[PDB]
Write a protein that binds this ligand. Structure first.
Ligand code: NAP
Ligand code: QXO
Ligand code: QXO
Length: 316
């Protein structure tokens, strides 16, 4: 299978990238260095992950040592919710660029459609446990993102965790200058996203699947939760193909024309997770994996369920 997908900005995006949420700062430099050595060319980052400086050390070492050229890398980051105000967007992007030791990002995403009150706290809460919103309209946040393209700080802009009506709002924005290149959403056999994926793809927006392995290290995991990596039905498909369960879970979105960003800090898993370009799931396998949907989310943003722009009340 081809390694990159063409975006609506004319650039090509590697379909497999390395995730970095929860990657400890003392381990993520090694993780990214190993990833680049074994073929990864796309790293998924975010300011809220609190490890971009350490990701940047790895990228810079591999650039300096001429393991890879900058034009061969595809580095993604995301604007956190407390920086939706138009006057804060550039500085937030520039902090990410400084930390990553880059002079541009390949893709910069609005991390969530929900804006929060600015300040030092990433999740400013009130006494009900609900987030303190900001009044900046997302269309205005989008215009600030467009300015980053025109200033050369980012090659492409996109969105994350936007539902179909929110994607539609941008696509219908008065005076829209750049369409979103990507919508990055949770997607795996327990949250298959047929409706939202079809909508985005029909508009030329590439979808990136996050938490493709079901995020077993998510901080709020409970014992009674389902577990993709331990699902015997998925293990059976993996065994039939002589691959690991994780490799099936990564190949699955690839065959839906999605980008996928599995996270690991374990060198052997980083290498294993990339060995997914040499086998094919059958149509029957694909339909069978789709049949496991249960609309089950790792990332439900539960402190924000009353925010006016909370994305997950709508069907898709
Ligand atoms: N836009 C958003 O709002 C958003 C939200 C969630 C995630 N994301 C992005 O998507 C990335 C991936 O999602 P995620 O981090 O939630 O979870 P994930 O990639 O589904 O799962 C990561 C977990 O799987 C383990 N793992 C990795 N490869 C494995 C293998 N071959 N066999 C067994 N276990 C394996 C990792 O362990 P080790 O690391 O210990 O090896 C870690 O515990 C994130 O890191 C982030 O970059 C974005
Ligand atoms: O936004 C993220 O990429 C990951 N994340 C970090 C904190 C957090 C909280 C809730 C959630 F639903 C996802 C979350
Ligand atoms: O908010 C949530 O979507 C899930 N969650 C549940 C407990 C918890 C704690 C911290 C956090 F950052 C997210 C959390």
């Amino acid at each position: 299978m081809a390694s990159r997908i063409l975006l609506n900005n004319g650039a090509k995006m590697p379909i497999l990238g390395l995730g970095t949420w929860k990657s400890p700062p003392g381990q993520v430099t090694e993780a990214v260095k190993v990833a680049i050595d074994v073929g990864y060319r796309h790293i998924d980052c975010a300011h809220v992950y609190q490890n971009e400086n350490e990701v940047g050390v790895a990228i810079q070492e591999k650039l300096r040592e001429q393991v890879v050229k900058r034009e061969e890398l595809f580095i993604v980051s995301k604007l956190w919710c407390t920086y939706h105000e138009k006057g804060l967007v550039k500085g937030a992007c520039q902090k990410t660029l400084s930390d990553l030791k880059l002079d541009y990002l390949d893709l910069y995403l609005i991390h969530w459609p929900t804006g929060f009150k600015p300040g030092k706290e990433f999740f400013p809460l009130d006494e009900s446990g609900n987030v303190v919103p900001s009044d900046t309209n997302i269309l205005d946040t989008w215009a600030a993102m467009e300015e980053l393209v025109d200033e050369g700080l980012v090659k492409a802009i996109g969105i994350s965790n936007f539902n179909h009506l929110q994607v539609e709002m941008i696509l219908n924005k008065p005076g829209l200058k750049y369409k979103p290149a990507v919508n990055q959403i949770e997607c795996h056999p327990y949250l298959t996203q047929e409706k939202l994926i079809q909508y985005c793809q029909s508009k030329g927006i590439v979808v990136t699947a996050y938490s493709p392995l079901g995020s077993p290290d998510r901080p709020w995991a409970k014992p009674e939760d389902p577990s993709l990596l331990e699902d015997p039905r998925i293990k059976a498909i993996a065994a039939k193909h002589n691959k690991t369960t994780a490799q099936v879970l990564i190949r699955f979105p690839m065959q839906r024309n999605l980008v996928v960003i599995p996270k690991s800090v374990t060198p052997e898993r980083i290498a294993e997770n990339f060995k997914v370009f040499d086998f094919e799931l059958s149509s029957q396998d694909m339909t069978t994996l789709l049949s496991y949907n249960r609309n089950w989310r790792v990332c439900a943003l539960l402190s924000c369920t009353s925010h006016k722009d909370y994305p997950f009340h709508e069907e898709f």
